[PDB]
Symmetry: D2
Subunit: 352 residues, 4 copies
């Protein structure tokens, strides 16, 4: 028996008592040391983004301590401090041999926590294939910084990776929530010169400057496109990373990218039948404006590499954490903080 903060049904959350998970021969049981709520947890409960769920523990961002391992786990022992990726895919599928573990076994099936499997907002959680989906966490990295790696860092950096940024290129980041702020840092880690951040909330404008943004575009001062087309003197941006906004942010991205550039989306679109690609500004189909959109990489290797970027001081994700709470109870308060969305909020963390 263990307790966990779960989604009871649509529009309903509460604490439930559940059977403590048991590990298979290749699995591990981890208890959380620090968790953070996601905008997907809000979208899952109150908007049915993944369908109906009943008594499903929420959360997919956790650093924890290994409690038990299966008989065939060889690299992780009880007591180990580990960083747990948000996506813990099955590594023995055809999609992995194609190079897309994010979709191992189905579209976005690499993401299991709080989807097809109880999330991390519990006293314990299950990790499948520990040797492939766990990374050792150095003590030198504080917990609140490390818990930004499972999703926030790997998603934002993936946007910069998908953008195929060349050295000195001009990159626009549309949306500067916690994911967008990691896209700014990621663009700087891909050699971007000028980085134009698009957002309004002062807490995020300040963090965007910290992570490398050279320009701030407020949608209040006029259309994003015009602002960006003037900042670049009609040349456009080499790449645009979509990290937030409505479906029509796709149209904005296509309009600001020069012919031959890339639109890299890592934002979750939860409404509309269509994401609009403007026919004229996409060259009527022929502008060579590549559109990409991908779930964040997970697994052990991805986490180890992002841990090294924190360890060797190439990025400090702790500026994303605006709220830290203590105690298991405060998972509810941090979750509700993600629904209610103050103005000073980037990301909350609950330390256990």
């Amino acid at each position: 028996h263990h307790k966990g903060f779960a989604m009871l049904s649509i529009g309903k959350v509460g604490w439930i008592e559940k059977e403590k998970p048991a590990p298979g021969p290749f699995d591990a049981i981890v208890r959380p040391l620090a968790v953070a709520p996601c905008t997907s947890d809000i979208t899952t409960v109150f908007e049915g983004a993944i369908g109906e769920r009943h008594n499903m523990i929420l959360g997919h961002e956790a650093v924890g301590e290994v409690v038990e391992v299966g008989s065939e786990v060889k690299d992780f022992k009880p007591g180990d401090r580990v960083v747990v990726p948000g996506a813990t895919p099955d590594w023995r599928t055809s999609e992995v041999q194609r190079g897309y573990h994010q979709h191992s076994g189905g579209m976005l099936a690499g993401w299991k926590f709080s989807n097809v499997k109880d999330g991390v907002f519990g006293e314990f959680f299950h990790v499948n294939d520990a040797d492939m989906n766990l990374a050792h966490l150095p003590k030198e990295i504080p917990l609140e910084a490390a818990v930004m790696i499972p999703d926030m860092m790997t998603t934002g950096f993936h946007g910069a990776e998908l953008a195929d940024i060349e050295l000195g290129a001009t990159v626009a980041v549309l949306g500067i929530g916690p994911v967008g702020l990691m896209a700014v840092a990621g663009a700087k880690l891909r050699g971007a010169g000028r980085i134009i951040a698009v957002g309004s909330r002062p807490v995020c404008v300040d963090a965007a400057k910290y992570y490398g943004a050279t320009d701030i575009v407020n949608y209040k001062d006029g259309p994003i496109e015009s602002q960006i087309m003037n900042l670049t003197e009609g040349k456009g941006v080499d790449a645009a990373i979509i990290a937030g906004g409505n479906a029509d942010i796709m149209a904005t991205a296509v309009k600001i990218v020069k012919p031959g550039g890339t639109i890299a989306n890592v934002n979750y679109f939860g409404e509309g039948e269509v994401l609009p690609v403007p026919r004229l500004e996409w060259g009527c189909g022929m502008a060579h404006k590549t559109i990409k959109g991908g779930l964040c990489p997970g697994g052990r290797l991805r986490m180890e590499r992002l841990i090294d970027l924190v360890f060797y001081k190439r990025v400090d994700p702790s500026k994303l954490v605006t709220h830290v709470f203590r105690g298991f109870d405060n998972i509810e308060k941090a979750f509700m903080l993600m629904k209610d969305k103050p103005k000073d909020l980037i990301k909350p963390v609950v330390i256990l």
Copy 2:
């Protein structure tokens, strides 16, 4: 002075008298030996796709004989038989240094004929930068086959290039007009195993089989997405090449491509404000289904390489030519042939 079949205004075409073009120091004057009409010309005249034009000679697909050269032209001399690419870009721009001559000087600015400059449907036409935008035509290649290289072959092959086909991958070609038929041949030249061609006219289904299609999906037997999902046993295709159809064929392509696959568009969309990307079937933004759309490569090097594939018997584009006419007078007949679209038409050629 000379004559040419021109667009007089929206909806009106006819023969006009123009001053004979003179070459700049790097340019060449070519008289046509063989011309082909396009589907774009229909759209340009009767739908105002590129705005308003007055006395603009039409056509952009020609093989011809060099008549005069500029004072600095070094590899082409009057009398030379040349293949003229549909895209003749200015090669001294920043977009060329970025690797996108198709947009040298602006979006799709690499396409000049019958756009910003008099087309090839005249007794002569102007070719800018002869040394960079002309390719010698071997005697061994018949004219009607060679005039399928300037646009049809380079566009269809470009769709196969953009698709990032892996050896043995399953490729769908959506639309089997002349561009789609060259996309089938291009997919076969990229090592595709199974190639599923989607089209209905029997003349195109037969040419699709000839160029490498292993399956024919007729809209008759049900929705394309269910037919392809049945052929691939729920797996989908590794890549889909869009070579024709309405804006909503973009939705079809995304729905049939595996997560992680590529949608490669080389079709021109002339209607609607938006090209629809299905939000659900695009993984809500995270299915890793890359969408590309690009104008065909032009210039000398692209033509030389495509000429070599014809010379070395890797593709024979002559099966695309279903109508051959022999007079300058008959340029109008071939032009109207692309407007009326009879069911026996793939591409017409006028030999001069």
Copy 3:
């Protein structure tokens, strides 16, 4: 359980061993057709991979599944399968890096007749059946299918590494069974002119069959000068090394134009150094990329290569010049590869 094994540096014979048992994810396969390799000769008679005692040889087999572990989901006893020469462990860091050929160590993806009993036995063990087995359609004859595990995937991999562009000129150095598959692979990547370098009339004939447009005999003079004359001093866009001594590396660099690629899939078994010509490599700055890689393995690679045979994009049966029947002839076919007679490309031993 009998098997043709390596007794030591120069001694081979049929041996009696314990029949292998499958782990929960493994399968036991009996061979239907096997082929001997040049690497087995190098292993037995030259101690290239060290000393081994009672190790069954061979790594190229198509067979019938006899038993599977309790967790195999896609393969049952009776299934006729193609077994890749490389059967890697799919749960390592190198797989997450995208290099299963080196999963667990350099070339560790190759286990048969190296770290594990080969296929020259009444049974052999396949690790991770669901990831390392491909169903073989009834339509493909056995001698054709047994060219897929190594010959086809290696030769095609050379063409893949060469980064061939449509219409490019490709040189293939060496037209043994791997080189002839490199010729076919180059033709599957859209190569225009294909220059094959080889001597034996049986192999020159197969090179023409697989797409070679030019044949270079080292007897009519040096390669380097013959190819420079064929290309009128331009060189080739890519060179695939599929045979020869260490100094063939120098030949390849000399014939590729600046910016081209040298793709090696040949195994070099003598010398401390493979020579890169300093002058013809631009003193380090000619942009002539050099690649060299072990063939891909696993289920997905075999399924895709099976589709190229099934859909008649390549027919490897022209590689099979001698077919033997019965277990007896494994020794005869194996010994045939120590001093390859001049009409031999690849031999096949059919067992059932």
Copy 4:
């Protein structure tokens, strides 16, 4: 007429006066504001690296003021302060259409200054195709910083580009001269986590730490290869950038790069016939260790993008400047500084 510091013949340098160059219609005449000597200048004179030259003005690294432009120059007028790339290629060749302007018209033919054309160590110098080979220099960037862009920065960054660094990868930089220090900075701009710099001189070891080096490997303390394998616990590096050393530094790089990694050379090798690739540590041809080696990119776009990296404070090249001189007289003394390489020297600059 004008003066320039020239190479008279092998080993002898001196002042000569020559006809002042005149611009073609697309060219510009530039007078230097700041110059720097190169290791290529020493090698060219004292080792005959590029053959025999007589009265050839040396130097290829300069920022300057445009003095006159041809009738067709559109973006540069007399008085403009410009950054002049070391490589000023002819942009209308087939190699440009292949994407390798560094070799436009022949191997390394993109480099003209102090090679096929008088260098920058004169009162004036000629720049071909000003609109394609000149970049405006903002007043905000000091001259000694800007003169590290034409060669030092673009070469070092190109080493990082060729290395295909993934986010968090471990990179080794072999040689920490001014190019190697820019390779260190470049690796940090591609998201390298751990960067291992190999060098001895304290002025360069300290600059390497400043540019992102996390480890310094001294050739004193034992073999580099054994030293680097110890730092990485036998794993090796994901990529190695060669920026100096003997021919067998190529052997060092291959030994320290893990299977699947990349060896990227940007060092100029001036002695020996062969660069040795170790057969065993190259997987006997199959270790997937890609070897690249390329001349630095030039042209306007490359300079504009690196100017942006300086302008937006992503890299500061000024600590490469250890000696500053004032006067055209002092070019001789700075050139001699690169001959008699003191020890506190990284790069000298002559401000005019």
